[PDB]
Design a protein around this ligand. Structure first.
Ligand SMILES: N=C1N[C@H]2[C@H](CS[C@H]2CCCCC(=O)O)N1
Ligand SMILES: N=C1N[C@H]2[C@H](CS[C@H]2CCCCC(=O)O)N1
Ligand SMILES: N=C1N[C@H]2[C@H](CS[C@H]2CCCCC(=O)O)N1
Ligand SMILES: N=C1N[C@H]2[C@H](CS[C@H]2CCCCC(=O)O)N1
Lengths: 121, 123, 123, 121
């Protein structure tokens, strides 16, 4: 559970994200996706509950990745919102929103939604 | 543009968002919500496209607030995903996901989704 | 109330929604979209709570439109999930999911999410 | 692929839904959930693409369930939007929205979002 968010995680797509969880709620690290107009690592920043409940619940967290790095700019940003659950097999279950910058004309179709499950395997 | 996003913003619920856009695509600031099991200010961190398009396209950005501060802890976190659209009346149109920590069993009802529009007041 | 939902509604994009609420909680009608790879009217079917609450709570409902008719086929379907709120100015506030058929590989980008507000004009 | 949507499907939660796909795009059947303020079968109605593309893509579909039957009324409705994919192991991958009727005061928290995968196993 605590600390354990820190590590390298992988999702079903093969994306990899390396995060560091700070004692007070911050999440910092890099994200490398396996799909989209992405190329290399991208910086990610987020927050998590540094004092989750002492009952059998997960730890709420979220993070953002703007898809711009020294190699590509896909003019989009993704936010993942979910919870971490530890145990012999820890995982982070998330739902995400990917918004692309559009002209007002196409704002209605600017956001994709999906889900990703991350494990340390 | 960092400058354009930087400022004080408010949404239809009456919540306050104070943000500074850094040159590196970083967003930091505080959020004051008008609703929920939230009391006072909460730290927020996000990222935005610091090199958007010359198209009248919006600038994509997103940020997260974990609802825990020194006074309260709602054991939940919200992420806002949207676009900043400048002009005389600058707006940040978003869609958000609010996830609460739950037991495996009620995880199916852990996430709420909605949308918020922010209007700029100050830098 | 079936009666209250029954009518012609329009949303901010300029799309038309003609619906009849049946006594059994059924919704049937047609949708005319102002946007997308959609041309003409499409059949819609949904359900609503025919026994809502005496609370000023909204009436929950939802409906689906597969974007295929005798003139076009966009190979996608949208479901709107929301609440009907009556009064002098009746509204149906919704959030929708638009899924396109894709190959396993691009399934990660198969669904769009948004929100639409409908205003009633006629019964 | 075609016809094959018709059948009894189960999701990870144990919910069961029996659907009939009509030649022209309609989906009709019953839903029995394993979670929430649900009890028995609930009627469901939806639509699907009766002429999906002839390429390796899934068939888009969606359906709604108002959670009211002769036993319970949870004053909510769920819509599932996703696509069907056939093969030796067919499945329906969906994302859903569950909206509860609220007073304006609580409209901001009226909708839950999740995902369900259905198989005939
Ligand atoms: N690991 C994941 N990669 C895709 C989903 C959500 S974010 C997305 C990659 C998008 C890359 C940039 C783009 O194509 O816009 N999960
Ligand atoms: N300004 C906003 N406040 C509500 C929406 C999205 S997040 C939410 C407030 C939740 C407060 C903490 C909680 O109740 O968990 N917008
Ligand atoms: N009235 C609305 N039209 C758009 C939104 C949600 S569904 C969408 C139209 C899509 C048309 C068919 C398509 O492009 O796939 N509201
Ligand atoms: N099979 C599923 N059951 C839950 C999710 C989406 S709908 C939901 C059951 C809700 C029952 C009524 C309620 O609790 O409001 N998937």
């Amino acid at each position: 559970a605590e600390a354990g968010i820190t590590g390298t995680w992988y999702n079903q797509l093969g994306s990899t994200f390396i995060v560091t969880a700070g004692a007070d709620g911050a999440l910092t690290g890099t994200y490398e996706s396996a799909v989209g107009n992405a190329e290399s690592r991208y910086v990610l920043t987020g927050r998590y509950d540094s004092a989750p409940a002492t009952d059998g619940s997960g730890t709420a967290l979220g993070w953002t990745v703007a898809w711009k790095n020294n190699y590509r700019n896909a003019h989009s940003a993704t936010t993942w919102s979910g919870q971490y659950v530890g145990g012999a097999e820890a995982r982070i279950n998330t739902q995400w929103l990917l918004t692309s910058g559009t002209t007002e004309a196409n704002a209605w179709k600017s956001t994709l939604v999906g889900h990703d499950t991350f494990t340390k395997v």
